[PDB]
Amino acid sequence: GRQDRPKEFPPPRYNYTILTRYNATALASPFIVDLRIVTATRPCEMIALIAKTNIDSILKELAAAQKTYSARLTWFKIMPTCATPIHDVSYMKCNPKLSFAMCDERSDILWQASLITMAAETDDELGLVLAAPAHSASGLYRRVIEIDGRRIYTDFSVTIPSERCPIAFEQNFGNPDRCKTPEQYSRGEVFTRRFLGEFNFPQGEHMTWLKFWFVYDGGNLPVQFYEAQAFARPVP
Amino acid sequence: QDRPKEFPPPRYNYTILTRYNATALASPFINDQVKNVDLRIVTATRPCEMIALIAKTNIDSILKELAAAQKTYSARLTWFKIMPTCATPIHDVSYMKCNPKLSFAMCDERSDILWQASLITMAAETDDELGLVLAAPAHSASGLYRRVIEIDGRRIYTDFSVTIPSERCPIAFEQNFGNPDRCKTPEQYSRGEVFTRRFLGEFNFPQGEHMTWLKFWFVYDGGNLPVQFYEAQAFA
Ligand SMILES: *[C@@H]1O[C@H](CO)[C@@H](O[C@@H]2O[C@H](CO)[C@@H](O)[C@H](O)[C@H]2NC(C)=O)[C@H](O)[C@H]1NC(C)=O
Ligand SMILES: *[C@@H]1O[C@H](CO)[C@@H](O[C@@H]2O[C@H](CO)[C@@H](O)[C@H](O)[C@H]2NC(C)=O)[C@H](O)[C@H]1NC(C)=O
Ligand SMILES: *[C@@H]1O[C@H](CO)[C@@H](O)[C@H](O)[C@H]1NC(C)=O
Ligand SMILES: [Mg+2]
Ligand SMILES: [Mg+2]
């Protein structure tokens, strides 16, 4: 069945409008937290950075306040001296009675360009799936959710084996053009629109193509994407 | 504004060999035969245009010879931007099991369809797969583009001199074509070190789908879509 390209896709959860012109403010610095563990046990795994957040607490506050809000989602890979934004979306005109990112408007759906065919958001748009990342994708990933000025942080400690994966692709996450120093964030000099590419397919279609491309390359699709576990406190 | 759901039917059903690794890229620097390369002119006079790099070749005469020889054949298509000290490959496809009774690239097999990752959403092949369309390129995309068609060991060259207004296009994206990571010196080519699989990304949509999405995305950004694409005029 791997031959047949898909032609029907899950219907989107909400019909938004993409404001192609919207110039977001400079990125708030990611250098300051809930820590999740993601470790691959084999080469060429499809891994999932998924983690629930007590955010519906915040949206109930906004919903009772009868206030529609703007928000923002950004994924960073954190290096020892810099941080690379790899996925970024701005949201506006959100009804707080709905789920996050079910908003009337949004910026371009922005990605590090070489990630387009190797990554996608999960169904609730808050998680990130990586198809066969290389060993160099090991490290620390930080999800920053911005909702009405407040910021929720989630860290993912990701382990990829060093055995070569024949379908992996080197992402050079630490290249200085995309790996921004703490100063560049502080001076307000980091604008995702300038160096991240757009890919405005809805998540349902992006994910559908990611799975089809991965299996077509010979990957083994997991039965189920699982929430990344919190770091395990020791057992006496 | 409403997303496309019907696409032109493909010219030919082909199989993509995702594992295939082409041999190193032949140097595009043809210092010896600089004088006789078919050179075309392509100029935009307003910002944010969609331009086409189209040029007929004598490829059909080569295909007739192979057809008379009943010779199933291999072939390669590669586009470069030629800078003064290096050359950036920006699109690359290898073709195998080619039936010489058909048109170029109507082949039973091919490699991944490779692009500079940041071009995916801003470029696409034309219907015969030999031309190249750029949607809202920036001023820095001005310059010399060289198309290298390799067929049964033979190589056909077409050069395009492209001019883009200096005024900033608001929907354009900087491609950093001159970056050493992707712009390769003549020595790197001669030493057999340039492997497109290493550093170009894939976009395995058939041309008809890629071209359809390209047009829809351009128009959605407020681009003016030209009535039709024309062959570039020769240097006169
Ligand atoms: C998003 O938009 C689509 C298309 O406008 C909606 O699907 C249509 O919904 C209307 C009203 O119920 C039906 O009459 C049509 O038959 C549906 N299909 C089409 C092709 O128009 C879809 O329900 C919308 N979803 C949300 C969450 O607003
Ligand atoms: C096949 O193409 C790959 C690029 O996708 C080349 O990979 C690198 O080649 C160099 C030199 O041979 C090695 O030092 C690297 O370790 C290779 N990378 C990986 C990820 O293995 C490869 O050289 C090509 N195959 C050849 C030339 O036989
Ligand atoms: C491609 O294959 C489908 C069947 O999967 C067929 O119906 C279609 O006609 C084929 N296209 C061409 C151009 O042969
Ligand atoms: Mg692939
Ligand atoms: Mg756009």
Residue numbers in the entry:
A (entry chain A): 39 to 70, 77 to 280
B (entry chain B): 41 to 276
Sentences reproduced from the published study:
Equine herpesvirus type 1 (EHV-1) and EHV-4 gDs interact with equine major histocompatibility complex I (MHC-I) to initiate entry into equine cells. Of these, gD is the (main) receptor-binding protein that interacts with the cell receptors and triggers the subsequent fusion process with cell membrane and/or uptake by endocytosis.
In the crystal structure, two ions interpreted as magnesium are trapped between the molecules forming the dimer which are coordinated by residues E242 and D261 of both protein chains together with water molecules. Although the ionic contact and high Complex Formation Significance Score of the here solved EHV-1 gD dimer interface suggest a similar function, no dimer was observed in SEC, SEC-MALS, and MS analysis. Therefore, we suppose that gD1 has no dimeric form on the virus envelope. The same is true for the termini of chain B E31 to R40 and N277 to T348. N-linked glycosylations are visible at the predicted sites N53 and N61 which are conserved between gD1 and gD4 but not in gDs of other alphaherpesviruses. EHV-1-gDF213A displayed a significant 2-log reduction in growth kinetics and low titers in cell supernatant compared to the parental virus.
